[PDB]
């Protein structure tokens, strides 16, 4: 039961992070019983659909899905066309169009291309939102790879409206491939998940959109720095620890008096 679900999670966790959709497609025909369970618990690359009314692309997730149709953020319509679907309020839609404009500018500044989507809905006291960002590489400029990012924000108001509580959780999936003469091929991929909580003042000088965008921007910069420094750096260190230039029986020739220096310095300090 749950042990099979945990085994499937631990199985597809240690699979290569470039063929996630293909590996998930031929994993679900093994046991087609927890198909509804793991699809709400694993991380997948996003899907792109096109709004024919406005001529813009928009991303597909489980927070704009009504059975099988998906609500577009630009035109506020479903595709395939249904009736009496799940809709935000007028204040929430007025918030959502500003959020989509602001995060479109965010995606233009930081990603220089790609698809961004923001979806909002109401809660018991505040409002929650999901920000999806997808960028694939440019094939004309010889770039192979993809970036996917999901951010979930929960906002709780405090009646008067002077300050509010924000809670952010983020998941970033990434892969890259370079083909060079000296290195051959180079594939690098993986995923990170982080959380954050913060109370912030809300006024005319700083509305909700600025606070949410600031938190998402700081989280994305932190995750990019962590991916470049900690994880790829550890992979580089493992590569240098497997095979080594500056031969192992020959690099100990310049580590002879260093032991004596260290031991007399520990004598001096004690």
């Amino acid at each position: 039961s749950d042990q099979q679900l945990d085994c499937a999670l631990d199985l597809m966790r240690r699979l290569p992070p470039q063929q996630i959709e293909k590996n998930l497609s031929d994993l679900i025909d093994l046991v087609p019983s927890l198909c509804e369970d793991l699809l709400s618990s694993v991380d997948q690359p996003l899907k792109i659909a096109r709004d024919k009314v406005v001529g813009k692309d928009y991303l597909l997730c489980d927070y704009n899905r009504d059975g099988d149709s998906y609500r577009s953020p630009w035109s506020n319509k479903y595709d395939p066309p249904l009736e009496d679907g799940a809709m935000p309020s007028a204040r929430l839609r007025k918030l959502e169009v500003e959020a989509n404009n602001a995060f479109d500018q965010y995606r233009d500044l930081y990603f220089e291309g790609g698809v961004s989507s923001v979806y909002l809905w109401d809660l018991d006291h505040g409002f929650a939102g999901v920000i999806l960002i997808k960028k694939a590489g440019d094939g004309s400029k010889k770039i192979k790879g993809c970036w996917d990012s999901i951010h979930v924000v929960e906002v709780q108001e405090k009646s008067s409206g002077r300050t509010a509580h924000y809670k952010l959780t983020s998941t970033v999936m990434l892969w890259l491939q370079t083909n060079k003469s000296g290195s051959g091929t180079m594939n690098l991929g993986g995923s990170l998940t982080r959380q954050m909580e913060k109370d912030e003042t809300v006024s005319d000088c700083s509305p909700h959109i600025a606070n949410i965008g600031r938190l998402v921007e700081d989280m994305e910069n932190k995750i990019r720095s962590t991916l470049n420094e900690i994880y790829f750096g550890k992979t580089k260190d493992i590569v240098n620890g497997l095979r080594s230039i500056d031969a192992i029986p020959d690099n100990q020739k310049f580590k002879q008096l260093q032991r004596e220096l260290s031991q007399v310095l520990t004598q001096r300090q004690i």
Partner: protein, 278 residues
């Protein structure tokens, strides 16, 4: 549902895509998801052998030292393999990775003077550069001509520090005077999963040529081209890691925008106005 042959094929696909070091966890996952032991032990039995022949698995035999490499080039049939240095044949257990029944074997004397000269220098090279390195040298005739195959492997499985790694390298040349073509395939696979997950897979194909002479000189030339290929491959990997954040990672997400500052969220229209004037 789907037929059991399709399940066997996709289980073999899952097994052959396993990272280095993580075999028993993948085996536990497939044996707990399939819930059918009889179709897994014998329905997909070449998958384990194929994984061990691809990952260059070192096996410590009883008695002699210098654990041998399980390749597809030294396959004897009925789960038997050979040791070119020990002149022996053994039976390998893929499930428990255990060596048994070490029966002696005799090889032909043609590929002997051209094998030990390469083997001694290759063991010297692997001891000289690789820390936990193992190496094997095969010599056999395929296209009407004897050829030499070299296999180098190094693994550093550290599950408590949440990472595993593997270097594999294969080299091949057909002995034919006065010159021959060397072909090498170099593979690296690294997994690191401390708080998230990151994997690296890489390979390189290197083609060069060498002159043919007596055994010691051509062994030294083989070691020299192996050194001058793998050193440049590792240095190029390091230099590629140096310039990741400015060339390839910038093509997906920049660290800062082109304004070199954070976004002023009270001035979104001031960013949007500047692109409307052609």
């Amino acid at each position: 549902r789907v037929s059991d042959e399709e399940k066997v094929r996709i289980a073999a696909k899952f097994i052959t895509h396993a990272p280095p070091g993580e075999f028993n966890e993948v085996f536990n996952d497939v044996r707990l998801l399939l819930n059918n032991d009889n179709l897994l032990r014998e329905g997909a039995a070449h998958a384990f052998a194929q994984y061990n022949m691809d990952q260059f698995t070192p096996v410590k035999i009883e008695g002699y030292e210098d654990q041998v490499l399980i390749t597809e080039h030294g396959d004897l049939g009925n789960s038997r393999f050979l040791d070119p240095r020990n002149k022996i044949s053994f039976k390998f257990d893929h499930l428990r990775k255990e060596a048994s029944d070490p029966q002696p074997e005799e090889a032909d004397g043609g590929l002997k003077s051209w094998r030990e000269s390469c083997d001694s220098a290759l063991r010297a090279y692997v001891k000289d550069h690789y820390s936990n390195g193992f190496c094997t040298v095969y010599a056999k005739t395929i296209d009407g001509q004897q050829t030499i195959i070299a296999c180098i492997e190094s693994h550093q499985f550290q599950p408590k520090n949440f990472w595993n790694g593997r270097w594999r390298s294969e080299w091949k040349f057909t002995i034919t005077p006065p010159t021959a073509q060397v072909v090498g395939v170099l593979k690296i696979q690294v997994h690191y999963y401390e708080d998230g997950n990151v994997q690296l897979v890489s390979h390189k194909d290197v083609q060069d040529s060498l002159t043919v002479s007596n055994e010691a000189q051509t062994a030294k030339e083989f070691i020299k081209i192996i050194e001058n290929a793998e050193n440049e491959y590792q240095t190029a990997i390091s230099e590629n890691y140096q310039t990741m954040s400015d060339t390839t990672f910038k093509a997906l997400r920049r660290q800062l925008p082109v304004t070199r500052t954070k976004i002023d969220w009270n001035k979104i229209l001031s960013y949007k106005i500047g692109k409307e004037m052609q």
